[PDB]
């Protein structure tokens, strides 16, 4: 079964917080309301939109002992006409449910949750900024809530959603084979809390070595998997002399991003160059770099969208990536086309109106 | 800048809770808990307070990015009604390593242990004394940053709860599913730390084991199908090796193995006896198979705090059920291990492994 948006209960706030006047630091500023839905042996209770408030959790809650937790991330955008739209939200709903099944957490109806999320954004519509490059970040979470120390499928769970208003400079990456984000047969291809905790120390290491993000390598052939919490793309002339955009395939160690899929879809549509999903090795990159075949390297993801890379520290070898000296033409094109779609300049099936 | 047991604040429950009389593991809790807060002004004062819910910001990094780690150790009440913790220093060592791995705040292991001692003291009447019973102690350290950025927490909570637990068993053996598709941990990963993130993903695997008529998961690693762990327990094999020497083998701490306190204790006990080879070496399924055909395997078992020492009698590997003659061999080793541990844990023999409350 599932909760229904028709059963939504609304509790407007009586202490509305002051909106930001000024820099928006990602994921630190929250809106006045939140979605909340509980599950137990009776199934799903009724969804409610209520004032933003703390969670109350039993000390034995399995969300805190055995990381029975998963999350999502998507953006709503306000056009000049003040119309708010969510970017490809159905894909997040699909991904959220796959995550839930992987952690033996309760299933729900994707279209019911999306509607609840729509209602929640509608209540807080004034929190959605409209300055250029600004958006509203939507964070759905599902956690197990069993008050028991046995490692087991939970009999209670909690689904909730909070919102943040959020506000092109290239980055350097540390590429060290010692660090492993995920493995074939693991859970790196699901957006589960457990995949993130262990990266915090690796990210501090990147900073100490003068880099900004982590380029996650995998396997004997040092495959480029992902960059920070973003998917990685390479625009180059491949060894066979063909110009292509390549990103790693979904073989278990890649989180299937929405921006990622969107970029593949966009480039495939254009039909101007080869667009493939194939592994990428450091060996291939060094060679392509020495032969001037790399045009652009970039990460993709909701929070930072499409972010260029200019440097990769591979062990002690400091490699210049000429992304910015190549425009970066593809990056700009993607950003321009995405911006048109996102802010309702060009109406498109990808957008879901709030 | 650790918290201090000298600075403990105590707050006794207004209305105590009625003890149990059928104790299911990890469901029943005691009257009090320990709680310590950390922030940019460091650690606050530890406190003992009535058992109560946590209040967390909905953005808490503990729930979004699994900034969470735990421990598990037992306290036992002997005939003399004295209560003792089994080798708690090892759990404190392990917890601090977990903390560091997750960039969570460092603390003083002896201060924490004194606070746990004070906490068990306060609830000492909850520690049962029937044969096979103990008190399970569950310390937890979680991140508590109200931010969606994946980052080093500037806030944290350290708490400890207690559960009286009953006799899990005479030893009843289990069946295992050995399917290499399921990978618990990877070299360079965090499988060797007691982090919450390592457990969530195993819930589905365990259901699959139950669907296929097995009771626990035998976690295999690498192209040569190394036996690493069984469920949430370390794995031991008692056999005559390929060189003709009777040995007790357990996989070494190469990164994909959680260094159990019971595991180390079985190694320490077996070495002290001096009666057979005691070694830490990779065990492959190919090795176990050849040893099972040539009749060289005596016993296979799991080691861990919750279930102490658990016999295995069947492994389902490549759709073929392999029989493990553990029970036919006594199981002598297991029974000897269980007896000595019991004597030590319940104070029958004095031993430096036990820490009095
Ligand atoms: C994670 C520490 C607390 C804990 C939870 C839990 O579910 N289990 N289950 C076991 N043992 C089950 C088991 C029995 C025999 C073999 Br062989 C392997 C596993 N121990 C804990 N501990
Ligand atoms: C996990 C979803 C929310 C989230 C958290 C977070 O910390 N980050 N950081 C990034 N991007 C940083 C970055 C910048 C450039 C490159 Br190339 C790679 C990563 N995105 C999120 N999202
Ligand atoms: C969320 C995420 C991405 C990309 O996600 P989008 O769906 O494009 O926002 C990539 N990699 C990791 C590790 C992530 O957590
Ligand atoms: C806790 C744990 C062990 C060892 O447990 P001890 O109680 O310290 O002996 C072994 N394996 C896994 C997966 C664990 O979580």
SS3 string, chain B, reads CCCCHHHCEECCCCCCCCCCCCCCCCCCCCCEEEEEEEECCEECCCEEEECCCEEECCCEHHHHCCCEEECCEEEEECCCCCEEEECHHHHHHHHHHHHHHCCCCCCCHHHHHHHHHHHHHHCHHHCCCCCCCEEEEEEEEEECCECCCCCCCCCEEEEEEEEEECCCCCCCCEEEEECCCCCCCCCCCCCCCCEHHHCCCHHHHHHHHHHCCCCEEEEEECCCCEEEEECCEEEEEEEECCCCCEEEEECCCCCCCCCCHHHHHHHHHHHHHCCCEEEECCCEHHHHHHHHHCCCEEEEEEEECCCEEEEEEEEEECCEEEECCCHHHCCHHHHHHHHHHHHHHCCCCCCCCEEEC
CA distances from B6 to A175, A185, B48, B356 (A): 46, 48, 13, 19
For ligand 1, whether the C-beta of B302 sits within 6 Å is yes
Place of tokens 């050849």: B290
The gap from C-alpha A353 to its chain's centroid, in whole angstroms, comes to 20
What is the number of other CB atoms lying within 10 angstroms of the CB of residue A304?
18
Classify domain A1-167+340-354 by CATH architecture: 2-Layer Sandwich (3.30)
Direct distance between the N- and C-terminal alpha carbons of chain A, in angstroms, rounded to an integer: 25
Paired strand residues for B258: none
Nearest to B201 among A187, A197, A204 (CB): A187
CA distance linking residue B262 with residue B233, whole number of Å: 9
Long-range contacts of A343-346 (CB under 8 A, 24+ apart): A343/A77, A343/A78, A343/A79, A343/A80, A344/A77, A344/A79, A344/A80, A344/A81, A344/A83, A344/A85, A345/A79
Q: Length of chain A in residues, anyone?
A: 354
CA distances from A82 to A305, A345, B176 (A): 22, 12, 59
DSSP A232: E
B222 touches A: beta carbon within 8 Å: no
CA distance linking residue A95 with residue A108, whole number of Å: 12
| Residue A213 · residue A173 · CB < 8 Å | yes
Does A218 carry a binding-site annotation? no
Interface contact B200-A59, CB threshold 8 A: no
Strands (E), chain A: 9-10, 33-40, 43-44, 48-51, 55-57, 69-71, 74-78, 84-87, 135-144, 157-166, 171-175, 213-218, 223-227, 230-237, 243-247, 274-277, 294-301, 305-314, 317-320, 351-353
Of B73, B82, B86, B83, give the one whose Cα is nearest residue B268: B86
Backbone angles phi, psi at B27, to 5 degrees: -105, -40
What is the number of other CB atoms lying within 10 angstroms of the CB of residue A6?
9
The gap from C-alpha A38 to its chain's centroid, in whole angstroms, comes to 24
Backbone angles phi, psi at B127, to 5 degrees: -70, 110
Query: Token pair of B247, please?
Result: 């040995």
CA distance linking residue B317 with residue B314, whole number of Å: 10
Give the residue ranges of DSSP H helices in A271-312. Answer: 282-290
CA distances from B74 to B53, B261, B327 (A): 23, 11, 27
Say whether domain B1-168+343-357 belongs to CATH 3.10.129.10.
no
Place of tokens 């307070």: B49
CA distance linking residue B48 with residue B39, whole number of Å: 19
CA distance linking residue A53 with residue A30, whole number of Å: 11
What is the number of other CB atoms lying within 10 angstroms of the CB of residue A125?
16
Distance A344 CA to ligand 2 centre (A): 25
CA distance linking residue B152 with residue B145, whole number of Å: 8
Q: What is the resolution of this structure in A?
A: 2.2
Provide the shortest C-alpha distance from residue B56 to chain A (in Å).
Answer: 5
Ligand nearest to the backbone CA of A75: 3
CA distance linking residue A74 with residue A337, whole number of Å: 18
CA distances from B272 to B158, B265, B269, B277, B278 (A): 37, 10, 5, 11, 10
Which residues of A fall within a CB distance of 8 Å from B54? 56-59, 61, 64
| Residue B217 · residue B182 · CB < 8 Å | yes
Instruction: Output Rg (C-alpha) for chain B, integer angstroms.
Output: 21
DSSP A273: S
DSSP A272: S
Q: Length of chain B in residues, anyone?
A: 357
Nearest to A59 among B54, B63, B180 (CB): B54
| Residue B323 · residue B313 · CB < 8 Å | yes
Superfamily of structural domain B169-342:
D-amino Acid Aminotransferase, subunit A, domain 2 (3.20.10.10)
| Residue B191 · residue B182 · CB < 8 Å | no
Q: Please, is B236 exposed, middle or buried when counting C-beta atoms within 10 Å of its C-beta (0-12, 13-18, 19+)?
A: buried
Decide if A1-167+340-354 and A168-339 have a common fold. no
Give the residue extent of every domain in chain A: 1-167+340-354, 168-339
DSSP A4: -
Provide the shortest C-alpha distance from residue A74 to chain B (in Å).
Answer: 13
Backbone angles phi, psi at B356, to 5 degrees: -75, 145
SS3 A260: helix
Distance A303 CA to ligand 2 centre (A): 6
CA distance linking residue B154 with residue B146, whole number of Å: 9
CA distance linking residue B142 with residue B102, whole number of Å: 9
Q: Which residues contact A294 (CB under 8 A, 6 or more apart)?
A: A234, A235, A236, A285, A288, A321, A322
Query: Token pair of A31, please?
Result: 């809106």
| Residue B72 · residue B35 · CB < 8 Å | no
The gap from C-alpha A338 to its chain's centroid, in whole angstroms, comes to 16
Query: Token pair of A259, please?
Result: 């921006």
Paired strand residues for A51: A33
Distance A263 CA to ligand 3 centre (A): 13
CA distance linking residue B46 with residue B34, whole number of Å: 7
Q: What b/e string do you get for B208-225 counting C-beta neighbours within 10 Å, with b at 16 or more? A: ebeeeebbbbbbbbeeeb
CA distance linking residue B248 with residue A250, whole number of Å: 42
CA distance linking residue A320 with residue A341, whole number of Å: 33
DSSP A155: S
Number of inter-chain CB pairs under 8 A, A vs B = 199
CA distance linking residue B235 with residue B71, whole number of Å: 19
| Residue B247 · residue B318 · CB < 8 Å | no
Q: Which residues contact A164 (CB under 8 A, 6 or more apart)?
A: A26, A27, A28, A29, A30, A31, A136, A137, A139, B148
CA distance linking residue A58 with residue A38, whole number of Å: 14
Sign of CA dihedral A286, A290, A293, A297: positive
List, as ranges, residues 30-69 from B with C-beta within 8 Å of A: 33, 51-60, 62-68
What was the structure determination method? X-ray
Sign of CA dihedral B53, B54, B55, B57: negative
| Residue B124 · residue B83 · CB < 8 Å | yes
| Residue A292 · residue A207 · CB < 8 Å | no
| Residue A43 · residue A3 · CB < 8 Å | no
Q: Which residues contact B210 (CB under 8 A, 6 or more apart)?
A: none
Sign of CA dihedral B240, B242, B248, B251: negative
CA distance linking residue B266 with residue A319, whole number of Å: 50
Q: Which of B227, B231, B263, B300 to mutate to test the pocket of ligand 1 (most atoms within 8 A of CB)?
A: B231
Interface contact A68-B200, CB threshold 8 A: yes
Cis peptide before B331 (omega within 30 of 0): yes
Ligand nearest to the backbone CA of A190: 3
Place of tokens 């969606």: B148
| Residue B288 · residue B317 · CB < 8 Å | no
| Residue A276 · residue A246 · CB < 8 Å | yes
| Residue B302 · residue B312 · CB < 8 Å | yes
Interface contact A198-B136, CB threshold 8 A: no
Q: What is chain A's percent helix, strand, coil content, to nearest 5?
A: 25, 30, 45
Give the residue ranges of DSSP H helices in A103-175. Answer: 110-123
CA distance linking residue A249 with residue A254, whole number of Å: 7
Instruction: Output Rg (C-alpha) for chain A, integer angstroms.
Output: 21
Torsion of CA B288, B290, B296, B302, to 10 degrees: 10
Angle at B293 between CA B290 and CA B295, to 5 degrees: 105
Query: Token pair of B271, please?
Result: 């070495």
CA distance linking residue B126 with residue B128, whole number of Å: 6
Sign of CA dihedral A23, A24, A25, A31: positive
Q: Please, is A220 exposed, middle or buried when counting C-beta atoms within 10 Å of its C-beta (0-12, 13-18, 19+)?
A: exposed
Backbone angles phi, psi at A153, to 5 degrees: -60, 125
Backbone angles phi, psi at B289, to 5 degrees: -65, -50
CA distance linking residue B45 with residue B7, whole number of Å: 6
Angle at A309 between CA A307 and CA A312, to 5 degrees: 145
SS3 A182: coil
CA distances from B198 to A194, A244, B23, B180 (A): 7, 38, 26, 17
Distance A299 CA to ligand 3 centre (A): 10
SS3 A229: coil
| Residue B161 · residue B135 · CB < 8 Å | no
DSSP A22: -
Paired strand residues for B84: B76, B356
Backbone angles phi, psi at B245, to 5 degrees: -95, 120
CA distances from B115 to A317, B53, B121, B194, B354 (A): 49, 20, 10, 21, 17
Q: What b/e string do you get for B16-52 counting C-beta neighbours within 10 Å, with b at 16 or more? A: eeeeeeebeebebbbbbbbbbbbeeeebeebbbbebe
CATH code matching the domain that covers A168-339, chosen among 1.10.3720.10, 3.20.10.10, 2.60.260.20, 2.40.160.40: 3.20.10.10
| Residue A67 · residue B68 · CB < 8 Å | yes
The gap from C-alpha A342 to its chain's centroid, in whole angstroms, comes to 16
Of B151, B99, B68, give the one whose Cα is nearest residue A228: B151
């Amino acid at each position: 079964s599932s909760f229904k948006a028709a059963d939504l209960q609304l509790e407007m706030t009586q202490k509305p917080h002051k909106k930001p006047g000024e820099p928006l630091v990602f994921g630190k500023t929250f809106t006045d309301h939140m979605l909340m839905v509980e599950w137990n042996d009776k199934g799903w209770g009724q969804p409610r939109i209520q004032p933003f408030q703390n969670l109350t959790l039993h000390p034995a809650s399995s969300s805190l002992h055995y990381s029975l937790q998963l999350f999502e991330g998507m953006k709503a955008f306000k056009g000049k006409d003040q119309q708010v739209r969510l970017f490809r939200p159905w894909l997040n709903m699909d991904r959220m449910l796959r995550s839930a099944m992987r952690l033996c957490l309760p299933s729900f109806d994707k279209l019911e949750l999306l509607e609840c999320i729509r209602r929640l954004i509608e209540v807080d519509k004034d929190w959605v900024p409209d300055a250029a490059g600004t958006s509203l970040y939507v964070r759905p979470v599902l956690i197990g809530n069993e008050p028991s120390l046995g490692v087991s499928q939970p009999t209670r769970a909690l689904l909730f959603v909070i919102l943040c208003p959020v506000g092109v400079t290239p980055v350097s990456l540390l590429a060290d084979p010692a660090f492993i984000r995920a493995w074939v047969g693991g859970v790196g291809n699901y957006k589960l809390g457990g995949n993130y905790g262990p990266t915090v120390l690796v990210q501090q290491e990147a900073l100490k070595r003068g880099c900004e993000q982590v380029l996650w390598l995998y396997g004997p052939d040092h495959q480029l998997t992902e960059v920070g919490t973003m998917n990685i793309f390479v625009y180059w002339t491949h060894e066979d002399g063909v110009l292509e955009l390549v990103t790693p395939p979904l073989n278990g160690v890649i989180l299937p991003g929405v921006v990622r899929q969107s970029l593949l879809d966009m480039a495939q549509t254009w039909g101007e160059f080869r667009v493939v999903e194939r592994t990428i090795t450091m060996k291939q990159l060094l060679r392509a770099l020495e032969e001037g075949r790399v045009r652009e390297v970039f990460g993709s993801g909701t929070a930072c969208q499409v972010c260029p890379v200019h440097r990769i520290l591979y062990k002690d070898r400091n490699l210049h990536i000429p992304t910015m000296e190549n425009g970066p033409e593809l990056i700009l094109r993607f950003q321009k086309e995405l911006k048109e779609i996102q802010y309702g300049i060009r109406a498109h099936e990808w957008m879901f109106p709030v």
